[PDB]
């Protein structure tokens, strides 16, 4: 398994954990996992900045950042 695919799966696991916790109404756990997905996605952006997948990484970073900013206001 390449470094790209391995990190992509890591980001996915975090993202799934965050959306699950989010829907269960656990703002903090949702936020923790979103941040961890963002950090892995930022790493993927550094490693493959000029590739075609980067636009999707960058899109998801922003979606997750925006969900963080909403959930932060609760708690």
């Amino acid at each position: 398994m390449s470094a790209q695919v391995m990190l992509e799966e890591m980001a996915r696991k975090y993202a799934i954990n965050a959306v699950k916790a989010d829907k269960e109404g656990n703002a903090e756990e949702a936020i923790t996992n979103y941040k961890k997905a963002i950090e892995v996605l930022a790493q993927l952006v550094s490693l493959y900045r000029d590739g075609s997948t980067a636009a999707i990484y960058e899109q998801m970073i922003n979606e997750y950042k925006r969900r963080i900013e909403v959930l932060k206001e609760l708690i």
């Binding site: 992509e8 980001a11 799934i16 959306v19 989010d22 829907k23 590739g51 997948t53 999707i56 998801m60």
Partner: peptide, 11 residues
Amino acid sequence: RELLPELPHPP
């Protein structure tokens, strides 16, 4: 290139 499966969108 695309992610398959898609990364989940937030609520």
